[PDB]
Design an enzyme around this catalytic site. Structure first.
Site, mmCIF file in Angstrom:
data_model
loop_
_atom_site.group_PDB
_atom_site.id
_atom_site.type_symbol
_atom_site.label_atom_id
_atom_site.label_comp_id
_atom_site.label_asym_id
_atom_site.label_seq_id
_atom_site.Cartn_x
_atom_site.Cartn_y
_atom_site.Cartn_z
ATOM 1 N N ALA A 46 -5.292 -6.417 5.149
ATOM 2 C CA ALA A 46 -6.534 -6.020 4.486
ATOM 3 C C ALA A 46 -7.754 -6.291 5.356
ATOM 4 O O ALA A 46 -8.604 -5.419 5.523
ATOM 5 C CB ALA A 46 -6.678 -6.732 3.150
ATOM 6 N N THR A 91 0.782 -1.291 0.000
ATOM 7 C CA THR A 91 0.000 0.000 0.000
ATOM 8 C C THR A 91 0.797 1.315 0.000
ATOM 9 O O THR A 91 1.913 1.378 0.509
ATOM 10 C CB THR A 91 -0.887 0.036 1.252
ATOM 11 O OG1 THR A 91 -1.747 -1.086 1.240
ATOM 12 C CG2 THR A 91 -1.813 1.250 1.297
HETATM 13 C C1 LIG Z 1 -0.103 -2.505 0.134
HETATM 14 C C2 LIG Z 1 -0.877 -2.744 -1.183
HETATM 15 C C3 LIG Z 1 0.743 -3.771 0.298
HETATM 16 O O1 LIG Z 1 1.291 -3.749 1.615
HETATM 17 C C4 LIG Z 1 -1.118 -2.347 1.361
HETATM 18 O O2 LIG Z 1 -0.414 -2.405 2.607
HETATM 19 C C5 LIG Z 1 -2.279 -3.354 1.402
HETATM 20 C C6 LIG Z 1 -3.403 -2.814 2.280
HETATM 21 C C7 LIG Z 1 -4.775 -2.895 1.578
HETATM 22 C C8 LIG Z 1 -5.098 -4.284 0.998
HETATM 23 C C9 LIG Z 1 -5.849 -2.539 2.623
HETATM 24 N N1 LIG Z 1 -1.928 -4.577 2.108
HETATM 25 C C10 LIG Z 1 -2.126 -5.769 1.562
HETATM 26 O O3 LIG Z 1 -2.518 -5.960 0.409
HETATM 27 C C11 LIG Z 1 -1.875 -6.923 2.507
HETATM 28 C C12 LIG Z 1 -0.404 -7.106 2.747
HETATM 29 C C13 LIG Z 1 -0.360 -7.941 3.872
HETATM 30 C C14 LIG Z 1 -0.636 -9.301 3.733
HETATM 31 C C15 LIG Z 1 -0.614 -10.143 4.834
HETATM 32 C C16 LIG Z 1 -0.309 -9.631 6.089
HETATM 33 C C17 LIG Z 1 -0.029 -8.275 6.238
HETATM 34 C C18 LIG Z 1 -0.059 -7.429 5.134
HETATM 35 N N2 LIG Z 1 -2.462 -8.089 1.852
HETATM 36 C C19 LIG Z 1 -3.460 -8.802 2.393
HETATM 37 O O4 LIG Z 1 -3.995 -8.591 3.480
HETATM 38 C C20 LIG Z 1 -3.914 -9.933 1.501
HETATM 39 C C21 LIG Z 1 -5.049 -9.387 0.674
HETATM 40 C C22 LIG Z 1 -5.752 -10.542 -0.077
HETATM 41 C C23 LIG Z 1 -4.770 -11.423 -0.876
HETATM 42 C C24 LIG Z 1 -6.801 -9.934 -1.015
HETATM 43 N N3 LIG Z 1 -4.369 -11.079 2.287
HETATM 44 C C25 LIG Z 1 -3.548 -12.086 2.590
HETATM 45 O O5 LIG Z 1 -2.364 -12.152 2.259
HETATM 46 C C26 LIG Z 1 -4.226 -13.231 3.336
HETATM 47 C C27 LIG Z 1 -4.476 -12.904 4.791
HETATM 48 C C28 LIG Z 1 -3.132 -12.802 5.478
HETATM 49 C C29 LIG Z 1 -3.317 -13.156 6.823
HETATM 50 C C30 LIG Z 1 -3.202 -12.189 7.823
HETATM 51 C C31 LIG Z 1 -3.374 -12.542 9.156
HETATM 52 C C32 LIG Z 1 -3.651 -13.863 9.498
HETATM 53 C C33 LIG Z 1 -3.759 -14.835 8.506
HETATM 54 C C34 LIG Z 1 -3.588 -14.483 7.171
HETATM 55 N N4 LIG Z 1 -3.386 -14.423 3.151
HETATM 56 C C35 LIG Z 1 -3.566 -15.244 2.113
HETATM 57 O O6 LIG Z 1 -4.465 -15.125 1.278
HETATM 58 C C36 LIG Z 1 -2.571 -16.404 2.087
HETATM 59 N N5 LIG Z 1 -2.225 -16.886 0.726
HETATM 60 C C37 LIG Z 1 -2.253 -15.885 -0.385
HETATM 61 C C38 LIG Z 1 -1.650 -16.585 -1.558
HETATM 62 O O7 LIG Z 1 -2.569 -17.604 -1.851
HETATM 63 C C39 LIG Z 1 -2.545 -18.658 -0.837
HETATM 64 C C40 LIG Z 1 -3.026 -18.086 0.399
#
Ligand SMILES: *[C@@](C)(CO)[C@](*)(O)[C@H](CC(C)C)NC(=O)[C@H](Cc1ccccc1)NC(=O)[C@H](CC(C)C)NC(=O)[C@H](CCc1ccccc1)NC(=O)CN1CCOCC1
Ligand SMILES: [Mg+2]
Lengths: 222, 235, 231, 212, 250, 244, 233, 240
Positions: free
Chosen positions: D49, D1
């Site tokens: 997210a 982000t």
């Molecule tokens: C920028 C774009 C990147 O840092 C921003 O900070 C964004 C914020 C927006 C989305 C509000 N952050 C993210 O995109 C964030 C980065 C992140 C990921 C994980 C932990 C901390 C920060 N991404 C997510 O939250 C993604 C969004 C999904 C893919 C739409 N979600 C995941 O990665 C999930 C949930 C992670 C998680 C957190 C806490 C406990 C358990 C899990 N994880 C997965 O989907 C795992 N994996 C993805 C690949 O496919 C197999 C499964």
């Protein structure tokens, strides 16, 4: 040490049309390099014209689907048989998933159906509940193979109008149910070719105002 | 003495029946439901002229699409309103939608019988819950401390209830406009009220699909009172 | 007299007066009728209103796709008990992938009502219930009383002036029991039965409440213009 | 982000990207990172997210309950502190949230509060939050003045996200613009980086590192 | 189920009386006479062993109880109430003192702990007061010898000498005439036996009388040797034979 | 159930009085009189023991006057057993304050907390109130010398001179007559004894039927001393004022 | 968190035209030590279901007790306990599947792989798998442990898909199962020669076969194998 | 825990325990609240059967809940301390979470909510206390005066009195207080408050307490001499 999670493989795919929506998923269930079942469905009709699939760790996937199905049942009891809208279902699922924020359901969830204007709707969830409505979403083992193909063929990404010097984009338009099923089938045959955890069979659930229809197709069994 | 959750020989809960007597002592509250909206009106009844009547809050907002009027031991209503508001907002959080008026009323009425030997006694207050939703449209509910709720086309509660209800029986029809309903509440309130009705000792409110739940100003009600008097003298 | 202060006290003749006073609350309640054949089970309920401006109190509650009841007495107590039944029907589905037997449904209600009649502080339930359902052993009709006593029947009725409908069904027993594969005729028999409990009032469109369950019929409720057929 | 929001003469500008990643996998290019709490309050979202989306939605419910109980719109300070006190209860549990509560009230005026998952709460005029915050800061700081016009402020906010969307691998998709005034927030459109980059490059003459 | 009696069963009447305490004191009045006398070099406590049946072995029933090696107790009133108080009194001497300070509590403080227990039965929910008055004789290094009375209310008073129970009024009068501040322990035992004969009706011998002293340390009753600072218990129960010896020169 | 046997200790009368509190006060009115008198340079506490017996050990006895800390003491009127429960609580509360703030507890704060405990027994819990009235005598560097009283209601008030227990009506009239603001400790000692001597139900006031205590700044330079009088010291002060 | 101590190896099973067959050897291994030889790992529930269990034997015995107790509980206040309201294979499975997943979710699993084989009241074949993770799946052929790797390939040559089930007789199906058990004896180091086999047919009902042995084995060719490469003697 | 339902309904629809708690308030010393154009004044009676009192240390009748809000009461003194303590804690808790001091309405609403909770909680009796809560909201110059009572109802008053002989002083205020024109100055407001208490009190010596609250946390208690000047002035004008 005991590991409470596992990977049951497989892949799922949701596409939304103008007055319909499809939610597809292969029927192969695996652990490591072994096939458990060649036909184990993971796309379910949950009532109120909502279809759902929770791909990844099957035990968590089944638990979630089971709980949402039950959520739909109690929504009827508590609110005078009111129809659960797709947007309301999505928000409800977020709370189911986030409820186990600190011991998550290891699944990529996708639901499909029609919104309250009668238009096709697909919602997708991460394992802990973040959700988003989209025209298009692939989830699971072969999501990385299928999704960019969908960007190109459903949302016409990187496609410009011929002879316009890359200035005018290819205009967005809804696809027919016939054209969507062609893309689903081609996506799954392609995924089957290049991903070992994908194959055996393809089961598609189509959602229109008339109800929920099913279609099945064979996939390569190697 | 005797148990709090005891049945009488006639098959009624003593405490619930006694709480109903407390509600009869309360100030009058009237509700009328139409196809253009639902109107809620109450008698403020200040105990002394020094009391600033605008601080008397007997009509209350639960959500944008649900309002509430009370009668009886009005202090008891605070925790009922608090519950209703939480229930309404919580449902919006869980389901990304407005909550049905009936479902809200049911949630409030679940508290009612949670007393015994949970709270120590039933509520000493009746509620008129008015609202709108997409399914069943404009609705008016009467929620008692017995845990029971009836939907009403029109309903009066409080000291002048039986007299006002008989008047509502004759006056109500299915084609009432909102303006007609407003006047009808003012008319019936002025009949059953002890002191003379004006903008300071009586309050009006309504709930419409478009503008949601609104409590009327003392300036707006004053004109509706003046409009009412002129129309009665006109024949 | 001196032995009706609470449910924990027996009278010298061995009676529980609080339980009997709870039974009295049912007699004041509006009439409701239950009857069944071999293929279907039907609930018919006379709804009651506060006045002409009010709605008519809903008497019938759905518990599962294959089970539900009608109430007579304290409605909030019926809500508590029906909710408990919903959970028990649901527990049977989630854990055993098994539709709850109507007989077990009765046993569970009996045991829930009983606990309230043997402990200090609590009170008996003030409502009677007629549970219908269709399970693996066909159609069923139960009568629940807040004393705890549950009874399986071909037909019955509870509430004010329920003796009229109960006598009619006792005469009509041989006729309506064999109404198999015909929903509308079984309802007609139930509507004619409840009519024997009417005084001064007759069955109108927003007064009558009917419910049915059967072999290829989920538990569904009919109100409003949907019951105009049977008047 | 990448998310930013800065205070200026004509109120508050708020700008965010729309990318969501799972490692190097670009999961989405169309995520709404601005939550519309009410007509006068905005919240930005960076980090996890689900954590952001769930708890900021929850924040909106708590703000609604405030104005029902108090017959008055909640202050930006009180709203931000509800969120910061919440995440502080979960401190150590692993929540990942970098948020900014932006809004206007009569008593406060235009106000921005930085709130993050380790409990930090800071009032300030300028903040950039996310993996590409530094790239946004570089452009924003070097062009920021208090006396910017509404038109120039909107552009700078947009241009700062674009800068980060370009350099930061974990930022991109499209720019969502908001302007907060005394009358409330005003949405200023979704701007896809696919077209916006080339439009900016040509018109501004910048991005000379890229093959034109 | 569960104890629903969470409310006080002892309450103030309009006249200001606490009924149950008064009635508990009445029960003590009906009880058998017991007494205590304080000498310069010791303390004596004594009581009659009212036997329920001649078939009963009165040796098994001990009215005079050891609480600590230097503290003893006797009662008048309801025996079962006394028994459980002795159990609690012995335990509290350990839990609230010996396990903290590595030594036995002084008489006044143990008495204070017993009083606290009896007070709580006067105010706590769903209980009646104890139906006994205690006489606690004891010794400790910094207070020397002492004698305390404890009533059902939880009130306690220190005494030079006193009596409680059946014939306490007459016994207290008798002790006023005989008591002086120069009494040796043997003289106090003699006066105790004289005082007790007045209230006893039937047999008067070592088998019907129970009597114990708080006097000099008893190294022979300690049970071990090797630690100079440990010199043995000051509490000693007089034997049936030891009483009869003093009844001849009476 | 058990409802049948509940006295309902924490309820109002039709007149708006707390039955049990009123009856507890009636109990206290029969207890030995206790007097507190506050002077400019100290405080006096005097109390009459309840009908003494000649065989009562007088020197190693404590019935009326108790020490809460080095700067605060109390005179008791009512049930002694009840008072001791409250005294130990008060002693602990004082030590908690010292542990927390490294400063001796202000008198009023201690009095308030003890009075708040009594209040609790009149409003909730269903238990009987403590049949006790206290006279608090103490010193702190804010208000200096202070006298308070609390009763079973949990209501407390400050005083220049006050009596509790028996014959307070007669005792308060005599104190009101002879008390004045520029009074010394030695004069207050004389007043306290003279008042008891006239209000006593006994034939004559003697050393063995009294408890006495002073709180002076009579120690060396800017520090407070608590003197709980010995039997012989009461005998001497009784002769010195010409009562015996 | 557990570690399995006394363990049971492969459980194999398949559907045929009129019912289901399930089999499992009679061994209770203690690591590499082949400790217990009289262990029954097929447990019938009523006359229409057989639960085959592999993994930890202490946990297996716990599950036995639960199933035993389930029959008792079902009989309570149930006049139709031996008729319409008798325990179905689907009921028994869902119960176990619920328990298995609840235990994994409390990080204290029943360290087992379970196959519930039976015939429903309407004649339909029931065959479904569940394990310590709560993972469930159904297939014409199901097997646990080494069975999954070696038996399934052989059993799938007989019934490769749904349409092959009506074409497969009980004679052909049992033959394949008995063959698979022999292959497992050749190749699984924690297997035994002795095993039990159960057939649940919709017509002939439950047939429980005990004390079977692997036979018609090929070992003769071993005599010709000398050394590990060059050696000729 | 003690569970008994002490506050319960009677056949005629009354909760006697709540009504008997009002009798306790009626027994209590009189308290009066009068709000002017730019101030609020809280007057309180102190009974003169208590001589030899120490007024330095004796609990004052008016209590500060925060620097900008005050609370006086009539009824059981011991009960009032519990409400005041709870209110003071809630005042600090509000500042901590909302970053803004309580409004007078909010503080009143809280106190009234506590009083209500004790009318339908098991094992407890209602508070034998009615309160007058007065002050000024943060950054606001409009005077606020609220009343609460054991039942839990609360409301705003231009002027109000509670306690013994309150019906006499309420009668006085009802004719002497003009809504259209409230006491314009501090002096006028204090005088009207003292006048109203002089209808009931007895002597204007150490029997009347007066506390003046002004905007922006400006609260001060008047001394004996300051109050005595109002008493002396009123009596001279009376003889006419
Ligand atoms: C920028 C774009 C990147 O840092 C921003 O900070 C964004 C914020 C927006 C989305 C509000 N952050 C993210 O995109 C964030 C980065 C992140 C990921 C994980 C932990 C901390 C920060 N991404 C997510 O939250 C993604 C969004 C999904 C893919 C739409 N979600 C995941 O990665 C999930 C949930 C992670 C998680 C957190 C806490 C406990 C358990 C899990 N994880 C997965 O989907 C795992 N994996 C993805 C690949 O496919 C197999 C499964
Ligand atoms: Mg493949």
């Amino acid at each position: 040490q005991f590991n409470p999670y596992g990977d049951n493989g497989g892949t799922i795919l949701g596409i939304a049309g103008e007055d319909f929506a499809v939610l597809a998923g292969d029927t192969r269930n695996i652990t490591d390099y072994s096939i458990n079942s060649r036909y184990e469905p993971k796309v379910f009709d949950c009532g109120d014209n909502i279809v759902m699939s929770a791909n990844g760790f099957a035990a968590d996937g089944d638990a979630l689907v089971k709980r949402f199905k039950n959520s739909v049942k109690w929504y009827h009891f508590d609110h005078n048989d009111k129809k659960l809208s797709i947007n309301s279902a999505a928000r409800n699922i977020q709370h189911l998933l986030y409820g186990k924020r600190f011991f998550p359901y290891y699944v990529h969830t996708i639901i499909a159906g029609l919104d309250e204007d009668g238009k096709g709707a697909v919602y997708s969830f991460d394992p802990v509940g973040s959700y988003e409505r989209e025209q298009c979403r692939a989830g699971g083992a072969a999501a990385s193979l299928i999704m960019p193909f969908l960007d190109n063929q459903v949302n016409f990404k990187n496609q410009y109008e011929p002879g316009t010097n890359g200035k005018v984009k290819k205009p967005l338009k809804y696809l027919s149910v016939e054209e969507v099923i062609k893309l689903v089938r081609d996506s799954f045959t392609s995924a089957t070719e290049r991903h070992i955890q994908v194959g055996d069979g393809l089961e598609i659930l189509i959602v229109t105002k008339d109800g929920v229809r099913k279609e099945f197709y064979e996939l390569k069994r190697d | 003495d005797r148990g709090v959750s005891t049945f009488s020989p006639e098959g009624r809960l003593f405490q619930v029946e006694y709480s109903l007597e407390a509600i009869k002592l309360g100030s009058t509250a009237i509700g009328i439901a139409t196809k253009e909206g639902v109107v809620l009106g109450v008698e403020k009844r200040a105990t002394s002229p020094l009391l600033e009547s605008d601080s008397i809050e007997k009509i209350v907002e639960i959500d944008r699409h649900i309002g509430c009027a009370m009668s009886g031991l009005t202090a008891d209503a605070r925790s009922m309103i608090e519950h209703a508001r939480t229930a309404a907002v919580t449902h919006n959080l869980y389901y990304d939608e407005d909550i049905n008026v009936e479902s809200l009323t049911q949630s409030v009425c679940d508290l009612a019988l949670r007393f015994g030997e949970l709270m120590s006694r039933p509520f000493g207050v009746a509620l008129l819950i008015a609202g709108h939703d997409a399914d069943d449209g404009y609705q008016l509910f009467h929620a008692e401390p017995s845990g029971t709720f009836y939907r009403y086309n029109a309903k009066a509660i409080g000291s002048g209830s039986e007299g006002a209800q008989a008047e509502l029986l004759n006056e109500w029809h299915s084609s009432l406009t909102l303006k007609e309903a407003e006047l009808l509440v003012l008319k019936i309130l002025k009949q059953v009220m002890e002191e003379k009705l004006d903008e300071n000792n009586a309050q009006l409110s309504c709930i419409t699909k478009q503008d949601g739940f609104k409590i009327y100003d003392n300036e707006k009600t004053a004109e509706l009172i003046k409009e009412l008097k002129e129309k009665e003298a006109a024949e | 007299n001196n032995y009706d202060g609470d449910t924990v006290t027996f009278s010298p003749t061995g009676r529980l007066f609080q339980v009997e006073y709870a039974l009295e609350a049912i007699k004041q309640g509006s009439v409701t009728v239950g009857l069944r054949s071999n293929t279907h089970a039907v609930l018919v309920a006379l709804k009651r209103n506060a006045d002409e401006l009010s709605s008519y109190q809903k008497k019938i509650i759905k518990c599962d796709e294959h089970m539900g009841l009608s109430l007579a007495g304290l409605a909030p107590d019926a809500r508590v008990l029906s909710n408990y039944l919903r959970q028990q029907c649901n527990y049977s589905s989630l854990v055993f992938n098994r539709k709850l037997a109507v007989e077990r449904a009765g046993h569970l209600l009996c045991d829930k009502a009983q606990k309230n009649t043997q402990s200090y502080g609590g009170r008996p339930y003030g409502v009677g219930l007629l549970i219908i359902g269709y399970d693996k052993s066909g159609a069923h009709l139960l009568e629940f009383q807040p004393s705890g006593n549950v009874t399986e029947l071909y037909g019955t009725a509870i509430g004010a002036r329920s003796q009229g409908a109960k006598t009619y069904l006792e005469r009509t027993l041989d006729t309506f029991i064999k109404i198999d594969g015909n929903p509308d005729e079984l309802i007609k028999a139930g509507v004619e039965a409840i009519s024997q409990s009417l005084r001064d009032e007759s069955l109108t469109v927003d007064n009558l409440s009917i419910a049915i369950v059967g072999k290829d019929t989920p538990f569904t409720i009919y109100d409003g213009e949907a019951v105009a057929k049977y008047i | 982000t990448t998310t930013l929001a800065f205070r200026f003469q004509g109120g508050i500008i708020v700008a965010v990207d729309s990318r969501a990643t799972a490692g190097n996998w670009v999961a989405s290019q169309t995520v709404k990172k601005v939550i519309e709490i009410n007509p006068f309050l905005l919240g930005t979202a960076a980090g996890g997210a689900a954590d952001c989306q769930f708890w900021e939605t929850w924040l909106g419910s708590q703000c609604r309950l405030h104005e029902l109980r108090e017959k008055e719109r909640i202050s930006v300070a009180a709203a931000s502190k509800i969120l910061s006190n919440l995440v502080y209860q979960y401190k150590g549990a692993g929540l990942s949230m970098g948020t900014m509560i932006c809004g206007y009230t009569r008593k406060e005026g235009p106000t921005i509060y930085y709130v993050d998952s380790d409990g930090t709460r800071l009032k300030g005029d300028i903040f950039c939050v996310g993996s590409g915050q530094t790239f946004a800061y570089g452009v924003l700081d070097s062009n920021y003045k208090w006396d910017l016009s509404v038109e120039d402020a909107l552009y700078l906010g947009k241009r700062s996200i674009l800068a980060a969307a370009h350099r930061d691998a974990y930022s991109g998709g499209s720019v969502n613009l908001y302007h907060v005034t005394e009358d409330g927030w005003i949405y200023h459109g979704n701007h896809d980086v696919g077209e916006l980059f080339w439009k900016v490059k040509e018109e501004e003459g910048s991005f000379n590192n890229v093959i034109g | 189920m569960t104890d629903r009696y969470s409310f006080s069963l002892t309450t103030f009447s309009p006249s200001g009386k606490l009924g149950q305490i008064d009635y508990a004191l009445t029960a003590v009045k009906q009880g058998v006479t017991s007494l205590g006398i304080k000498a310069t070099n010791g303390v004596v406590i004594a009581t009659e062993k009212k036997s329920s049946s001649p078939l009963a072995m009165s040796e098994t029933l001990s009215k005079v109880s050891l609480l600590t090696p230097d503290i003893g107790a006797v009662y008048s009133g309801m025996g079962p109430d006394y028994r459980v108080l002795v159990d609690k009194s012995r335990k509290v001497a350990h839990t609230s003192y010996k396990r903290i300070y590595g030594e036995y509590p002084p008489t006044k403080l143990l008495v204070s702990e017993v009083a606290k227990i009896m007070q709580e039965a006067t105010q706590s929910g769903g209980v009646r007061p104890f139906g006994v008055s205690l006489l606690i004789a004891g010794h400790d290094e910094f207070n020397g010898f002492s004698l305390y009375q404890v009533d059902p209310s939880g009130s306690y008073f220190p005494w030079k000498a006193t009596a409680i129970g059946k014939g306490s009024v007459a016994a207290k009068t008798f002790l006023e005439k005989r008591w002086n501040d120069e009494l040796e322990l043997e003289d106090a035992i003699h006066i105790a036996l004289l005082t007790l004969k007045e209230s006893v009706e039937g047999e008067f011998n070592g088998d019907t009388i129970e009597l114990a002293i708080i006097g000099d340390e008893n190294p022979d009753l300690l049970g071990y040797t090797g630690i100079p600072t440990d010199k043995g218990p000051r509490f000693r129960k007089l034997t049936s034979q030891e009483i009869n010896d003093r009844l001849e020169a009476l | 159930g058990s409802r049948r046997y509940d006295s309902r200790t924490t309820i109002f009368s039709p007149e708006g009085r707390l039955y049990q509190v009123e009856y507890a006060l009636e109990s206290i009115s029969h207890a030995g009189t206790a007097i507190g008198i506050m002077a400019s340079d100290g405080i006096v506490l005097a109390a009459e023991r309840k009908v003494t017996s000649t065989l009562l050990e007088q020197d190693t006895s404590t019935e009326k006057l108790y020490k809460l800390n080095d700067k605060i003491a109390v005179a008791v009127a009512g049930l002694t057993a009840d008072a001791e429960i409250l005294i130990n609580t008060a002693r602990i509360h004082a030590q908690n304050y010292l542990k927390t703030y490294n400063e001796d507890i202000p008198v009023e704060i201690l009095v308030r907390r003890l009075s708040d405990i009594k209040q609790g027994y009149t409003q909730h819990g269903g238990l009987r109130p403590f049949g006790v009235s206290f006279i608090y005598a103490g010193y702190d560097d804010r208000y200096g010398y202070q006298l308070y009283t609390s009763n079973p209601s949990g209501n407390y008030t400050g005083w220049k001179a006050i009596s509790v227990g028996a014959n307070t009506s007669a005792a308060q009239t005599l104190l009101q007559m002879d008390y004045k603001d520029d009074m010394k400790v030695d004069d207050a000692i004389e007043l306290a004894l003279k008042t008891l001597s006239k209000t006593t139900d006994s034939s004559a006031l003697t050393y063995d039927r009294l408890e006495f205590a002073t709180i002076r700044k009579g120690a060396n330079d800017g520090e407070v001393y608590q003197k709980i009088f010995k039997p012989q010291e009461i005998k001497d002060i009784l002769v010195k004022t010409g009562i015996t | 968190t557990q570690q399995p101590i006394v363990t049971g190896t492969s459980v194999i099973s398949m559907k045929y035209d009129n019912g289901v067959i399930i089999a499992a050897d009679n061994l209770g291994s203690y690591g590499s030590l082949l400790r217990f030889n009289g262990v029954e790992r097929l447990i019938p529930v009523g006359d229409n279901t057989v639960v085959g269990i592999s993994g930890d034997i202490s946990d297996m015995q716990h599950i036995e007790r639960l199933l035993k107790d389930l029959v008792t509980e079902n009989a309570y206040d149930n006049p139709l306990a031996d008729a319409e309201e008798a325990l179905e294979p689907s009921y028994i499975f869902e119960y176990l599947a619920t328990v298995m997943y609840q235990r994994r979710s409390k990080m204290n699993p029943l360290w087992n792989a379970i196959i519930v084989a039976g015939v429903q009241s309407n004649g339909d074949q029931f065959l479904r798998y569940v394990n310590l993770l709560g993972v469930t799946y159904s297939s014409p052929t199901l097997a646990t442990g080494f069975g999954a790797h070696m038996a399934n390939p052989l059993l799938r040559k007989v019934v490769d898909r749904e349409s092959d089930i009506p074409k497969t007789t009980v004679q052909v199906a049992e033959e394949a199962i008995v063959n698979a058990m022999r292959v497992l004896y050749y190749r699984d180091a924690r297997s035994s020669r002795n095993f039990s086999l159960a057939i649940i047919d919709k017509n002939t009902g439950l047939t429980f076969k005990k004390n079977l042995q692997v036979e018609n084995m090929k070992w003769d060719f071993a005599k010709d194998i000398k050394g590990y490469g060059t050696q000729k003697i | 825990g003690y569970d008994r339902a002490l506050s319960i309904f009677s056949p005629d629809g009354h909760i006697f325990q709540v009504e008997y708690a009002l009798e306790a308030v009626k027994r209590g010393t009189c308290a009066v609240g009068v709000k002017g154009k730019n101030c609020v004044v809280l007057g309180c009676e102190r009974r003169s059967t208590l001589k030899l009192q120490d007024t330095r240390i004796t609990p004052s009748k008016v209590s500060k809940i925060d620097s900008h809000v005050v609370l006086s009461f009539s009824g059981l003194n011991a009960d009032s301390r519990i409400l005041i303590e709870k209110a003071r804690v809630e005042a600090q808790s509000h500042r901590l979470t909302l970053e803004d001091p309580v409004t007078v309405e909010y503080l009143t609403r809280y106190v009234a909510g506590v009083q209500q909770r004790y009318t339908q909680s098991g094992g407890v009796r209602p508070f034998g206390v009615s309160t007058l809560i007065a002050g000024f909201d943060p950054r606001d110059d409009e005077p606020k005066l609220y009343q609460t009572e054991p039942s839990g109802i609360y409301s705003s008053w231009s002027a109000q009195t509670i306690g013994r002989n309150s019906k006499t002083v309420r009668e006085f205020l009802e004719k002497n207080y003009d809504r259209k024109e409230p006491p314009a100055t501090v002096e006028e407001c204090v005088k009207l408050t003292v006048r109203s208490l002089l209808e009931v009190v007895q002597t204007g010596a150490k029997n009347i307490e007066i506390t003046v609250v002004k905007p922006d946390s400006d609260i001060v208690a008047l001394s004996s001499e300051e109050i005595n000047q109002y008493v002396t002035q009123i009596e001279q004008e009376k003889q006419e």
